[PDB]
Structures are given as structure tokens and as C-alpha cells.
């Protein structure tokens, strides 16, 4: 069965490369050395009508929409996914996409800031934290997560499987048929265990540490949805992309 697990790993890696433009390898090549830096209002304007914090938030929303599209195309590649009840496919995407967004965002981050506009720019962490309340608090938890997540030193081949494991989560609210989802996830987990033990002999308990990050991701997502509720009321000027609205509705 090890050959079947390696074949699954390779299939997922190939699909990941096909689906996601700015991979961790490409990001890390940029981040280690050139992007323009956004670190203040002036550089923002040179980098680039509504208030500054809102303009940035709207930018983040459009990037998320592109990510939902890419993640969904990836999901379709996971063997068995499109043979699930379609209601459950939709539920898995609804609840999975944000977890995956924040996982993959860590690839674009270091402790000092985040790559933007396909790796052509870098927005400082300090600048994002400086934004007027409550916008100053959107990205900071993500940076805190990313610093801890990036300390695992995962590569793209590892991430491809981990993201599939997240999508095939049988504990999502509203699933109709949990057992076939868990059957797929069990195979994915076996593939991830093998991939990590192969690729990272220096860290025998990496599998454990990585899976424990799923708890972190869910907390980040919970907190994010809460900050949107706040914004929803008083920011009559924010405008939520209609796709993201679909995801957030009754989440």
C-alpha cells in the first residue's frame, strides 16, 4: 500500500501546482532575495474613493475570492471528492475554504509582513497593525499563527496533502453522509503521515504538531467571522463580495 500512498501524494502535489499560482517555494524565493514595500500611507498610495482601511480590506476580499476558486478546483482533484453527495461537497467547501486560506497565507508571510499582488509587493506587519480599529486587528492573529506554523518548515508537497485533509473533515455541521468522507480523509491522513516521515526525518512528531494546528486554524476562523459581524453593522461602507457572503451565511 505504500506505493498507493506515494502515488496519491504525487497526484495531489501535481494538482496543487496546477491550481495555486504563488506556492511556498515561489514565496520563499522572493522573501529570501525585489517587491515594492507598503509601510505607510504614502507608499500605499504609490503602491496603488473610500477610506484607507476599507480600500485595503476590499483588496483582501478580492484575493480571498481568487483563493476560493483555486481551492475549489483543487478539491475537485482529490480522489473521491466529486463522487460524494453534492450537498456534502458544498458543506465541505463552505467550512474548509477559510481554514485553507489561512494555511496558504502563512506561506506568503514572515514575522515582518506579507507578500501581495502576486509577489510583486510586500505589506509590512507594522502597517497592517497600525490601521484604525478594528481593521488593525484583522491580520495580526494571522501573523501570530503563521510564525508558529512556518516554524514547522513544511514544503509544498507536504501542504498539498495537509490541505486535502482539511477539506475532507467529517465533523463539519450539516453533513449528510459522514462515513465516506472519513474514508477518504483516513487515506489522506495515511498519505500525510508517510510524506512527513519520508521528507522530515529530523522531526519524528511533525505529524502530531501539524495536525494540532487544525485547532489553531478553527480558532482563527471563528475570531475572523466575529470581527466581520462587528464590521457588518457599523461599516455601511464595507461591501462584502457576494461569493464570500454565500460562504459566511449561516456558518
Amino acid at each position: 500500500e505504500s506505493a498507493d500512498l506515494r502515488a496519491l501524494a504525487k497526484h495531489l502535489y501535481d494538482s496543487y501546482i496546477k491550481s495555486f499560482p504563488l506556492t511556498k517555494a515561489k514565496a520563499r524565493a522572493i522573501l529570501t532575495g525585489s517587491p515594492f514595500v507598503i509601510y505607510d500611507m504614502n507608499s500605499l498610495m504609490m503602491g496603488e474613493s473610500k477610506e484607507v482601511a476599507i480600500r485595503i480590506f476590499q483588496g483582501c476580499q478580492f484575493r480571498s475570492v481568487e483563493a476560493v476558486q483555486e481551492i475549489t478546483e483543487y478539491a475537485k482533484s482529490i480522489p473521491g471528492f466529486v463522487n460524494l453527495d453534492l450537498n456534502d461537497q458544498v458543506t465541505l467547501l463552505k467550512y474548509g475554504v477559510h481554514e485553507i486560506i489561512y494555511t496558504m497565507l502563512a506561506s506568503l508571510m514572515n514575522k515582518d509582513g506579507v507578500l501581495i499582488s502576486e509577489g510583486q509587493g510586500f505589506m509590512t506587519r507594522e502597517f497592517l497593525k497600525s490601521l484604525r480599529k478594528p481593521f488593525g486587528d484583522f491580520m495580526e492573529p494571522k501573523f501570530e499563527f503563521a510564525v508558529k506554523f512556518n516554524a514547522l518548515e513544511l514544503d509544498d508537497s507536504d501542504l498539498a496533502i495537509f490541505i486535502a485533509v482539511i477539506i475532507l473533515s467529517g465533523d463539519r455541521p450539516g453533513l449528510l453522509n459522514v462515513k465516506p468522507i472519513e474514508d477518504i480523509q483516513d487515506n489522506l491522513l495515511q498519505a500525510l503521515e508517510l510524506q512527513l516521515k519520508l521528507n522530515h526525518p529530523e522531526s519524528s512528531q511533525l505529524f502530531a504538531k501539524l495536525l494540532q494546528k487544525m485547532t489553531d486554524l478553527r480558532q482563527i476562523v471563528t475570531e475572523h467571522v466575529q470581527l466581520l459581524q462587528v464590521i457588518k453593522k457599523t461599516e455601511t461602507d464595507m461591501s462584502l463580495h457576494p461569493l464570500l457572503q454565500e460562504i459566511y451565511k449561516d456558518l
Binding site: 478546483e73 453534492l86 461537497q89 458544498v90 467547501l93 463552505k94 454565500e246 451565511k249
Partner: peptide, 17 residues
């Protein structure tokens, strides 16, 4: 294809399907 929540997931379903 169609599913129970088609009307409230029209954009996500366009992507998937």
C-alpha cells in the same frame, strides 16, 4: 449540479460545477 441549497450557493456552485 443541483442540490438542496442551490439558490443560496449559486456562485460557489458555478465554481464547483
Amino acid at each position: 449540479x443541483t442540490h438542496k441549497r442551490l439558490x443560496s450557493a449559486x456562485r460557489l456552485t458555478x465554481i464547483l460545477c
